[PDB]
Every structure is written in structure tokens, then in C-alpha cells.
């Protein structure tokens, strides 16, 4: 369309702009923007300023340049120019800058400075293909929208639910009373949620210290306003720190079932994020469903073919057979290094000079490899060097042929890198690894866009949070954007989803606490990882494609007895009986009574089962049984149960549950997913080996770089972990009038890198994405041997954690993809009347003009629920009563209206109506309960009043249907869930005594006690969530004294009552991991294996609309031609749609 327009000089200047150079200029000056701003962030702290103070003009420089390009834009296409997206955003940013400094000139506030950070996107704006990338990412968001709302729906539904019971608890959380030693009773009148702390007391005063707040000291999380509940629901959805919400609420009445709420919430948020993964993978299958070098190799190899005293060495270029045998010998040489990489490393703090003469052996292996590279040099001279790998290995062996020089011990540490040469083996696996690395070339651009998002978000963050940064009292503050790298590590922090929470509660707390403008700051985090993790989720699809591209590439009488069906029936009654008995034994106290009859029962079942093994054994088993899983399972059932209680621990009663487990084999549905799993582990075992080898690599890295470190003192004020001795002040809060002595120092830092085994230890913890930044930070306090400190010493070390984490972002992410592909092939394997006045009222109601009306009524009820502020004092409460009365009357009235219809079918027919009837019932009942108020359960009834919202979902057509897909999906996978229970149900009991009697205290073991079985179910449930388990693990290595009221032991105490048992948690995380993997594949096969196809159909065909066409078919009969004529109108209408 353009505007105004003019010839003359304008066309010439535009022709100049049609050239080339200007592009590079604008781009590079944008780069100048990026750099200058990245510096500009350093620092801030309100006023002061330093070097940036001159840059302050320079942004005006960029301004005027860009503005000159705007003068060029005048020559562009005006209104026609607006149509371009990149040009649109560019013009936008231009307006932000013009308005920016244009406001600034009058100033001769900080929001303008925030608007400064908009610039970097222009870097994308100048770059081709990134537009293709982002145009791709936008497409991804659509086939997800429903579920997002569903999340929001839960986020609302739970909120309103939280806006009841938890709002009823909002009456609790907002207040407290207490005194004396922090021993006030929990959850029994006059009780309250406590601040975390290593002690907790909260001076207020309120007698001797108060005792309960969490709306601000814990930060916002309080359920009072609907908004804050929406917040706490976000973080609880994040599967991060939420359990603290639980122990808080539970601290104050009570252990009823808050857990039902948090468990349903966790499990569902889980369910549907898994569904998100399903949507993404569905996009993968969508693109791939239609989507589904030898020449040069022949060239190089045949040139090598024609290519074919020193001449004896030329004979040695091919000779001889020994060169094969020598490879076996070579396996020894690297093996000597395989220990040496540890042996030169082991131990730590100068302990054990294991490399007493190992250096000579290193010189010897260096001599052998040098002899090999030398003979290879004799083999073909320069042609041997033509291959880069040969000269590389030769340069490595020569590097080992060097010397102790020099001062950079990391060069000595490169010997660990020399160990990589041992990875040369493993035939064909390297090719698969090449297939893996090949994907990186594809995903790298998107990774760069991720780097960009990281960049903009980081800078803006720096100019926001760190743009104030300051927070008087009282450490550790951790990362808080005080400097650009700091913001890097912290953005990357919350990006992991690790403990972002505390960051955020430094965030809102930074702006003077919650109010009205400051709380808005929260939005950033909500903008952030919710999109940021989303960006990560987006990354999956890339791999999802690339990886699939690779995929695209008179004994007879007893025989009558055991085989008898009646014997199996007595075995069935025995099954129900033994199950009832073991379930009776599920409580810890059951053994205290007469459990012996149950032992006789389990003995009978073990007898019949071992007899079944005896029956199968006589019929061509043995070696077949050695091959077959089942008969081997029964024979192993025979031998393992026979293991003595003496010598190596065992407990036969725990095996009593196992005897009926064989019946699970009779189910076939589990066998498909299971066969899929056994097919899966074989499919990607090499990757697992690669990961473990990475564990070795980073192990060797950390050990010969950190071993002297971490032997921390208290605090930094001691440095030398030997200079440490005696007491040490601790000032509570900040005031230098509240001293408390402590026999402090030293500290083992929980996870030494003194040992490569310990390296496997801690490195696994960071592998969990759980608790690492603490380890990171203290790693940054490192220096020399026995010393910590300080602040931000040795920042370069921080680079390392990230690097490894980045690799975790690869293969782990690959792992989950792998399963899916087999399943995708597995799915392919799976593919292999009315009358009188009633006639009048029915006509009026059936018209469903009321539908929009009733809908509006419901939404207004929603807003009435939004009214729920529990500040002070009354007035509005009575109004709320009146409102609830209003809606309940309107609704019950409406149900009466519907009652005035089919009646015999209106009371049922279509099921939701019945549900509505339920609603009316609970509504009226609760109302009467309100009348009787002139009682605690009435809250649980008001829940029913909240349940009305679901009716909105009833109106949510082409959305609830997806939930119906979830419903049809729901059944088949449930069989696995029993094992999902059983995996706990075993280990819990298996732990229930072992880790039992660990004493309640205040460690990681208080309201989170291991005591009764159900609580054990919880403490093993946290581990499922990746919720700070390692601390709990740390508690269990030696623990405390008994339950400090139990049988204890004797005079013995001294926390001696617990001992090493890392294996339990460690193994359990993995078992839980694999079991959950099974949960993935189960959900997938039972749903998206159909449901993704359902997305493909609903997005294109009309299989779903056809049901609506049948609904049109309802308004008819059953023939004949007259029915065809009456339906001809609706038919002629339908086909157009």
C-alpha cells in the first residue's frame, strides 16, 4: 500500500539500501549493543556507576543510527512494510527506543532501562532461518492448547479447592501462638506451620518467641487471596519444594488427608505433563508418518588399495598375525592406565602415594604407543599422517612422552584425557555414536536460540532483580544477579527447575515484600521456565526427529493332582487368604501377634509353587529351564528361600508376598510392555555405557582438580582445615547482641571428591538435578588444599558443573526418546416425547437458550468464589452466604425444570445430569448446614459447591473428549501400577525396620518421620519426585539414637542406631526410574498409540464430527423413504460442512 511516497533522492538512497554493506553494519552494531549492555549490567546497585557511565551516550549513538535506518524505512514500503513480522518487531523496538530517550531528555524511570533490554531480539531479526525456526516453534504451541487450559483448569480447580480447605487453613497459616523451647504441639489446637531453619523460633516476641508464619517469611504461598493460592499451586505443580507446603499445612491440623490433595495434584500434574510429552511426540509422529557416502568410501579405500632396512618395516606395514595378538596384549596396557587414572589420582589430601612408581609404567605405555605410531609412520610415511586420527593418537603418545613440565598440573591431568584412547575399541558402537553426534549439527541452531533466550532473559534479569539486588540480612543469598556471570549461572539454575523457589523468594522479597506492584515481579519466573522448560521441551522434538531418522535408517497321580483345576481353585482361595494375611502383615505391629498361621499359609503356597517347579522339571525342563525365565524363576524361588538367616542377611517373611506374584504372569497385557522393555534395554545399552564412562571421565577430572578442596571450615574465617579448632560464634539474624557459641569446624562437605567412588557418588547427585547448586557454590569457594573462601573466588570453576550438566541434557534426553521409537515400532507391531403443558416447557428448555444463561450463572458463581479474601472482618461473608443461596436455588430450580421432562429419563439418560442431581443434593444439604450453624465437615460439603465448576467442563466439547480418550486409556496400564505400588510395598516394608528407629529430630525426620508404614510410603514417595532425597540419604548413613523412646539397644546411644545403607536409596531411585519408564511406555501404548492418531484425525478428518452427525440423526426415526425425505434437509445441510 505504501504512503506519501516520493521520487528524487529517495529512490537513490533506497537503491543504496538495496545493496549489501548496510546489513553487516547494522548487525555488527547490534553486536555492539549486546556487548555494551552485557557490560552495562556490571554493575548496578542503584547509583554509583563506573565505566558504563560513558556508554550512556553510546546507546543514543545506536539510537540515532537505527533511527537513520528508520529514515531509510521511510523509503521502504510504509503500510506495505508493516506486513513483515521481523520488520514489525523492528519498528516496534524503534518506537521503544524513540519513546525511551525521548522521555529521557525530559528527565534532565528505570522502566525505560528495562525497555533497553528489548534490543537483542534484533539479532534474530537480521538472521535468516531463525525466522524459520521460530515459525516452527509457533506451530508447536497449537496442538497443546487444550491441555494447557486443563493445567490452568486444575490450576483453577485446585485453587478454588485450595480456596476452601486451604483457605480454611488460610485461617491457620496466617497466625500462631507459642512459647519456650520450640516444642509447641503440632496439629492439636493452638498449632502452626513453622519456618524451615536449622532451629526455628521466630522472635516476635509473642511470649517466648512466636511460632508460625509462612505468607512472607516463607514468602508468598499463603492461600488467603486467590492469587497467592494460584502461586503456591504453580510451585506445587513444579514438583519443587511443594512437600514443604505439605509439612507446613500438616504441622497445623492436620494429618487427615492433605495428602489426598497433594497426591492427586502431583499425580495429575504428572499425568498431563506426560501428556504434554505425548503431544510433542505426536507432532514427531505427525511429521514422520509421511517423512518415512559409499562412493567416497570406495574412493578412499581403493586409493589405499593402489597405494599398497626400512623395507622390512614396509613388510611390517601388513605383517603379521602377531599384530592381532598384540591387540589382546594392548588390552593390558590401557588396563594399567585404567587403574592408574585412579591410582595416580587416589587417594587425596596427599594420602597414600599410590603412584610410587606408576610414572615409569606411564612412560612405558607411552613408549609402546610411540613404538606403534613410529612403526605406523614406517608403514606408509606421510600417508599414515594423512589420517587425522593417527597423528592425533601419535601426538597424544608424544604428549605422554613429554615431561613433568610445567606449573600447570592440569597438563598432568590431561593424562586422564589420554585414557580416552582406550575407548578406541567397542566395534560398531562408535558408528552409532557418530549417528548420535550427527544430530547435534541439526539441533545446534535451536540450541543457539536457547542460548539467545538465555542471554536476553539473563540481561533483563540482571537489570531487574539484580537491578536492585540488595537485600540486607543475612546470607547466603546465593546467586542474585550481582554480576553478569552470576545471572548466567542463576538463569541456568531456575532453568533446571532446581530450587528456583528460593531465588523467587529473594525476588519478591527484593521489592519490599508482597503488595501490588512487587508481586507482579513473580510473573517473570512464570514467563520464564514455563516457557523456558517449554523451549527445552521443544528441544525434544528436534532429537525426536533426528533419532527417528536413525530409526528410519505312581507319579502320574501326583501329576493329576498338581495339574488339577480344583487344586488351582484351592490355590485361589489360598491366594485370597495369603493375600489377606500379607495385607494383615503390612502393618509393622502384626508380627507382635499370632502371624504364624499366615506363615503356614505362605509355606503352603511356596510348597505348591515349588511342587509346580517339580512338575515342570520332569517334562523336558532343566536345560530348557536354564533357558526359560519361568522354570528358572521357580527354581530360584526354591533356592533363594532356602538361604539361611545366619551368614549374609535374609528375611523369609518378606518373601511371602512373592508367591502370588506369579499369577501376574497370567495377565498378558503386562507381557507386551515388558517384552518392549527387555527389547529396550538391549536397544540402548551402549549409551548407558557411554554415560557411565562419562561418570569416569568427569570423575578423573574432578579428583585431580578438587581433591584437596571442600574440607570446609566454619565459616571462611579459619581457612586452613587444621588451623580449625575450638569454639566459634554464631550471631542469630544479624544483630551483634545475640551470640551463640559453637564447637564448630571442620566440615567434610558431605561429598568429597577424595575418591573416584565418591565421585560416582556426588556426580550422581548432580545427575539427579537435585541439590547441586549448593555443591556448585561451595565448589566455587575452592582454593588450593585446606581452604575455602570466598564470595566469588575462582569463578572459572563454575564452568565445569554446567558443562557436565549439558551432556546430561543430551544422552538422558536421548534415552527417553529411544524407548519411544521402539514403541512406535511396537505400535506398528500393535498395528499388525412431550405432551400437554409439559410439551410446552420441554420446548422452552430444550431450545437451550438457557444453556448460555446457565453457563453465565456458573461463571458468575465462579467469580463469587473468587470472593474469598480472608483479611478482616465480616460483612461480605453474609453476602457470600446470600450468593451461595442464590446459585443453589437457581440450580436446584433448573434441575426441577429438567425434572419436568423425561423424568424417567431426565433423572438419568445422559449421565452428567445425574451428577448435577448430586450437586443439587450436596448443595442443599450444605445450605441447611449453614442454617444449623446458628460443623467441620461442612467444609468438605462446600467442596461440593466448588465442584460445580466441573459443569463448565461439561460444556467444554472437543476438550472433555480428550479426557475421554484419557479414560479409555486409563484402564489397561493400571496393572503396572500394582507393581508401582509393589515396588514401594516391598521396599517400604523392607526399609520399615531397617531404616526404622532413626529418631525424630529436625534433619532432612520429624514431621517427615520414617516411623509408621504410611509415612514411609511418603518418604519413599518424595524420592519418586526428586525432592531433596540426598539429604535424607545423608541422614541415614549413621543417623541418630533409636526412636529415642524405643528399645534402643542398651547403654549404647550416641546416634549409633543407624548405619550405612546407601544401596537402598540409590537402587531405589533407579528402580523407580525404570518403573516410571514403564509408566511412560504404558501410558503411551494405551493412549497416544491411538490418541496421537486421534489428534491426526481430529486435526484433519471428521471421525469426531461424525458422532455429531449421528446426534443429528437422533432427530429422526428408522426409515423409510419418508425418513430420508424429512432428513434430506439436515443431510443437504450437513454435507456442506
Amino acid at each position: 500500500f505504501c504512503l506519501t511516497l516520493q521520487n528524487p533522492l529517495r529512490k537513490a538512497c533506497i537503491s543504496i539500501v538495496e545493496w549489501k554493506p548496510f546489513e553487516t553494519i547494522i548487525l555488527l552494531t547490534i553486536f555492539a549493543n549486546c556487548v555494551a549492555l552485557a557490560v552495562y549490567l556490571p554493575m548496578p546497585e542503584d547509583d554509583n556507576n563506573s565505566l558504563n557511565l560513558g556508554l550512556e551516550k553510546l546507546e543514543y549513538f545506536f539510537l540515532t543510527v537505527f533511527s537513520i535506518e528508520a529514515a531509510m524505512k521511510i523509503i521502504a514500503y510504509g503500510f506495505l512494510f508493516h506486513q513483515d513480522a521481523y520488520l514489525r518487531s523492528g519498528w516496534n523496538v524503534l518506537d521503544f527506543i524513540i519513546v525511551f530517550l525521548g522521555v529521557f531528555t525530559a528527565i534532565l524511570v528505570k522502566a525505560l532501562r528495562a525497555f533497553r533490554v528489548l534490543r537483542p531480539l534484533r539479532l534474530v531479526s537480521g538472521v535468516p532461518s531463525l525466522q524459520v525456526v521460530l515459525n516452527s516453534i509457533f506451530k508447536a504451541m497449537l496442538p497443546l492448547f487444550h491441555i494447557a487450559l486443563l493445567v490452568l483448569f486444575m490450576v483453577i480447580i485446585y485453587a478454588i479447592i485450595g480456596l476452601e480447605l486451604f483457605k480454611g487453613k488460610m485461617h491457620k497459616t496466617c497466625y500462631y501462638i507459642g512459647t519456650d523451647i520450640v516444642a509447641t504441639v503440632e496439629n492439636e489446637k493452638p498449632s502452626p506451620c513453622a519456618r524451615t531453619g536449622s532451629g526455628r523460633p521466630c522472635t516476635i516476641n509473642g511470649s517466648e518467641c512466636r511460632g508460625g508464619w509462612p505468607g512472607p517469611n516463607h514468602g508468598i504461598t499463603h492461600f488467603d487471596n486467590f492469587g497467592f493460592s494460584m502461586l503456591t499451586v504453580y510451585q506445587c505443580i513444579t514438583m519443587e519444594g511443594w512437600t514443604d507446603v505439605l509439612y507446613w499445612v500438616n504441622d497445623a491440623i492436620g494429618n487427615e488427608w492433605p495428602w489426598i490433595y497433594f497426591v492427586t495434584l502431583i499425580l495429575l500434574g504428572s499425568f498431563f505433563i506426560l501428556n504434554l510429552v505425548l503431544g510433542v511426540l505426536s507432532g514427531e509422529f505427525t511429521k514422520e508418518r509421511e517423512k518415512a557416502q559409499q562412493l567416497e568410501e570406495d574412493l578412499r579405500g581403493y586409493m589405499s588399495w593402489i597405494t599398497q632396512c626400512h623395507d622390512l618395516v614396509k613388510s611390517r606395514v601388513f605383517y603379521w598375525l602377531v599384530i592381532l595378538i598384540v591387540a589382546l596384549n594392548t588390552l593390558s596396557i590401557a588396563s594399567e592406565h585404567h587403574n592408574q587414572p585412579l591410582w595416580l589420582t587416589h587417594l587425596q589430601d596427599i594420602a597414600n602415594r599410590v603412584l610410587l612408581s606408576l610414572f615409569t609404567i606411564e612412560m612405558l605405555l607411552k613408549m609402546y604407543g610411540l613404538g606403534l605410531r613410529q612403526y605406523f609412520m614406517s608403514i606408509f610415511n606421510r600417508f599414515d599422517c594423512f589420517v587425522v586420527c593417527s597423528g592425533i593418537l601419535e601426538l597424544l603418545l608424544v604428549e605422554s612422552g613429554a615431561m613433568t613440565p610445567l606449573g600447570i598440573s592440569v597438563l598432568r591431568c590431561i593424562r586422564l584425557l589420554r585414557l580416552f584412547k582406550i575407548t578406541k575399541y567397542w566395534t560398531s558402537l562408535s558408528n552409532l555414536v557418530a549417528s548420535l553426534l550427527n544430530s547435534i549439527r541439526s539441533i545446534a541452531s535451536l540450541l543457539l536460540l536457547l542460548f539467545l533466550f538465555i542471554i536476553i532473559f539473563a540481561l533483563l534479569g540482571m537489570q531487574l532483580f539484580g537491578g536492585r539486588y540488595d537485600f540486607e540480612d543475612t546470607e547466603v543469598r546465593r546467586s542474585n544477579f550481582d554480576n553478569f556471570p552470576q545471572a548466567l549461572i542463576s538463569v541456568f539454575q531456575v532453568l533446571t527447575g532446581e530450587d528456583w523457589n528460593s531465588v523467587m523468594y529473594n525476588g519478591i522479597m527484593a521489592y519490599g515484600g508482597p503488595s501490588y506492584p512487587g508481586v507482579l515481579v513473580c510473573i517473570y519466573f512464570i514467563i520464564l521456565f514455563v516457557c523456558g522448560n517449554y523451549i527445552l521441551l521443544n528441544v525434544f522434538l528436534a532429537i525426536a526427529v533426528d533419532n527417528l531418522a536413525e530409526a528410519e535408517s505312581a507319579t502320574w497321580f501326583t501329576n493329576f493332582i498338581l495339574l488339577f483345576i480344583l487344586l488351582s481353585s484351592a490355590a485361589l482361595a489360598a491366594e485370597d487368604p495369603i493375600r489377606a494375611e500379607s495385607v494383615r502383615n503390612q502393618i509393622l505391629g502384626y508380627f507382635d501377634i499370632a502371624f504364624t498361621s499366615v506363615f503356614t499359609v505362605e509355606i503352603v503356597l511356596k510348597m505348591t509353587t515349588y511342587g509346580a517347579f517339580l512338575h515342570k522339571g520332569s517334562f523336558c525342563r532343566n536345560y530348557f529351564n536354564i533357558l526359560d525365565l519361568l522354570v528358572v524363576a521357580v527354581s530360584l524361588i526354591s533356592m533363594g528361600l532356602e538361604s539361611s538367616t545366619i551368614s549374609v542377611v535374609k528375611i523369609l517373611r518378606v518373601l511371602r508376598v512373592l508367591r502370588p506374584l506369579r499369577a501376574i504372569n497370567r495377565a498378558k497385557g503386562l507381557k507386551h510392555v515388558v517384552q518392549c522393555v527387555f527389547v529396550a534395554i538391549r536397544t540402548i545399552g551402549n549409551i548407558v555405557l557411554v554415560t557411565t564412562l562419562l561418570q569416569f571421565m568427569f570423575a578423573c577430572i574432578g579428583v585431580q582438580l578438587f581433591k584437596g578442596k571442600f574440607f570446609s571450615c566454619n565459616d571462611l574465617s579459619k581457612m586452613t582445615e587444621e588451623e580449625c579448632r575450638g569454639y566459634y560464634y554464631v550471631y542469630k539474624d544479624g544483630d551483634p547482641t545475640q551470640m551463640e557459641l559453637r564447637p564448630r569446624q571442620w566440615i567434610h562437605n558431605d561429598f568429597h571428591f577424595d575418591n573416584v567412588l565418591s565421585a560416582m557418588m556426588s556426580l550422581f547427585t548432580v545427575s539427579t538435578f537435585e541439590g547441586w547448586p549448593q555443591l556448585l557454590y561451595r565448589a566455587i569457594d575452592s582454593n588450593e588444599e585446606d581452604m575455602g573462601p570466598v564470595y566469588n573466588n575462582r569463578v572459572e570453576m563454575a564452568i565445569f558443573f554446567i558443562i557436565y550438566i549439558i551432556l546430561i541434557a543430551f544422552f538422558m534426553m536421548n534415552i527417553f526418546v529411544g524407548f519411544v521409537i521402539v514403541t512406535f515400532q511396537e505400535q506398528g507391531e500393535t498395528e499388525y416425547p412431550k405432551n400437554p403443558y409439559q410439551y410446552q416447557v420441554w420446548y422452552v428448555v430444550t431450545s437451550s437458550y438457557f444453556e448460555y444463561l446457565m453457563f453465565a450463572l456458573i461463571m458468575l458463581n465462579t467469580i463469587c468464589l473468587g470472593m474469598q479474601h480472608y483479611h478482616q472482618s465480616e460483612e461480605m461473608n453474609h453476602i457470600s452466604d446470600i450468593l451461595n443461596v442464590a446459585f443453589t436455588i437457581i440450580f436446584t430450580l433448573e434441575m426441577i425444570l429438567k425434572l419436568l421432562a423425561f423424568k424417567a429419563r431426565g433423572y438419568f439418560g445422559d449421565p452428567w445430569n445425574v451428577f448435577d442431581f448430586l450437586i443439587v443434593i450436596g448443595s442443599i444439604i450444605d445450605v441447611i448446614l449453614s442454617e444449623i450453624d446458628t460443623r467441620i465437615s461442612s467444609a468438605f460439603f462446600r467442596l461440593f459447591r466448588v465442584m460445580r465448576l466441573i459443569k463448565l467442563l461439561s460444556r467444554a466439547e472437543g476438550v472433555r473428549t480428550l479426557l475421554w480418550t484419557f479414560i479409555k486409556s486409563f484402564q489397561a496400564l493400571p496393572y503396572v501400577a500394582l507393581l508401582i505400588v509393589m515396588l514401594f510395598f516391598i521396599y517400604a516394608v523392607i526399609g520399615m525396620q531397617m531404616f526404622g528407629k532413626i529418631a525424630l529430630v529436625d534433619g532432612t525426620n520429624r514431621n517427615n518421620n520414617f516411623q509408621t508404614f504410611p509415612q514411609a510410603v511418603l518418604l519413599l514417595f518424595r524420592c519418586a519426585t526428586g525432592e531433596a532425597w540426598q539429604e535424607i540419604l545423608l541422614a541415614c548413613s549413621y543417623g541418630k539414637l533409636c526412636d529415642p523412646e524405643s528399645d534402643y539397644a542398651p547403654g549404647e546411644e550416641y546416634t549409633c542406631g543407624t548405619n550405612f545403607a546407601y544401596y537402598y536409596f540409590i537402587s531405589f531411585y533407579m528402580l523407580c526410574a525404570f518403573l516410571i519408564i514403564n509408566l511412560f511406555v504404558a501410558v503411551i501404548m494405551d493412549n497416544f498409540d491411538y490418541l496421537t492418531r486421534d489428534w491426526s484425525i481430529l486435526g484433519x478428518x471428521x471421525x469426531x464430527x461424525x458422532x455429531x452427525x449421528x446426534x443429528x440423526x437422533x432427530x429422526x426415526x428408522x426409515x423409510x423413504x419418508x425418513x430420508x425425505x424429512x432428513x434430506x434437509x439436515x443431510x443437504x445441510x450437513x454435507x456442506x460442512x
Binding site: 574412493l299 579405500g301 581403493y302 593402489i306
Partner: protein
């Protein structure tokens, strides 16, 4: 290089020998070759093969004119043809250039046409000397096991 491998490996067994006569020529005016390779000399070389094979030693001919397996089809010799494959003509282009190329292309493309299942017993498509020599050597060891049953001695 191939005969070098076959010789140093199959030492004491293999009996490689050159054949100046064109054995493919071997099968009331008497037949006579118009070629310098007289048919009677060919008969003499065939008898030399009949004598050389009598010792039950391995034999690997180095015939010059036999560019294609089909030529030996009429022979009573029943040769063990070997096929040193180069599937890509461009590769052999660059090979011969790396040191008459066009007729070499028609010939190599011709040998590419042939049915591997019958026309050839072994395909030396391997690029490196080591693996290809391992294959052909394992093959000749297989034939060696085939021709020498334990009962014979």
C-alpha cells in the same frame, strides 16, 4: 597383490601359474584360431592344467585375456572365478587417473552387470587388503576342507 597374499599364505599348497594361451578358446573342416594363440597350444595348456590338478594342490590362474567370467563358461576347466568388485565407476575413474580409461569403464560397467549368484563364487568388494584377504583366504580354506576328506588318508 592378491596373488602375493594367496602365495605367502597358502605356501606349500597353492600352485599359481601363468597361462599365455587363451583358455577361453578351448571347447568337416578342422577348427583353427585366427588369433596368434593357437588352439593346439591351448590344448597343451589344458593338459598342463589336468596334470597340475592331479596333485590335488590348490591352483589359481593368472590368465591375461579373461576380463569376463562368461568366456570360461565353455571351458571344461570349471574355473573358480573371483570378483574384485568396484560398484562405483567414478571411483575407478579416479583410481586409473590417480597414477585407456574409457574401455576400462565399459568393461568394469560390464562386470558390474553380471549375476553375482552364479557367475561369481566370491566378491572381493572390500577396500582394504586385510579384510578382503581374510575373506578370500577363508573361502579357499573352505574349498580346501571340501576337497580333502579325512577318509582319503
Amino acid at each position: 597383490a592378491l596373488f602375493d597374499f594367496l602365495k605367502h599364505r597358502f605356501e606349500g599348497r597353492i600352485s599359481i601359474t601363468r597361462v599365455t594361451a587363451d583358455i577361453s578358446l578351448a571347447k568337416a573342416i578342422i577348427e583353427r584360431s585366427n588369433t596368434r594363440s593357437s588352439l593346439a597350444e591351448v590344448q597343451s595348456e589344458i593338459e598342463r592344467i589336468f596334470e597340475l590338478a592331479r596333485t590335488l594342490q590348490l591352483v589359481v590362474l593368472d590368465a591375461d585375456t579373461i576380463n569376463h567370467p562368461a568366456q570360461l563358461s565353455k571351458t571344461s576347466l570349471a574355473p573358480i572365478i573371483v570378483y574384485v568388485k568396484i560398484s562405483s565407476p567414478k571411483v575407478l575413474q579416479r583410481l586409473i587417473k590417480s597414477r585407456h580409461l574409457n574401455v576400462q569403464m565399459v568393461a568394469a560397467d560390464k562386470l558390474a552387470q553380471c549375476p553375482p549368484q552364479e557367475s561369481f563364487d566370491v566378491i572381493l568388494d572390500e577396500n582394504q587388503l586385510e579384510d578382503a584377504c581374510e575373506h578370500l583366504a577363508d573361502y579357499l580354506e573352505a574349498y580346501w576342507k571340501a576337497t580333502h576328506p579325512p577318509s582319503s588318508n
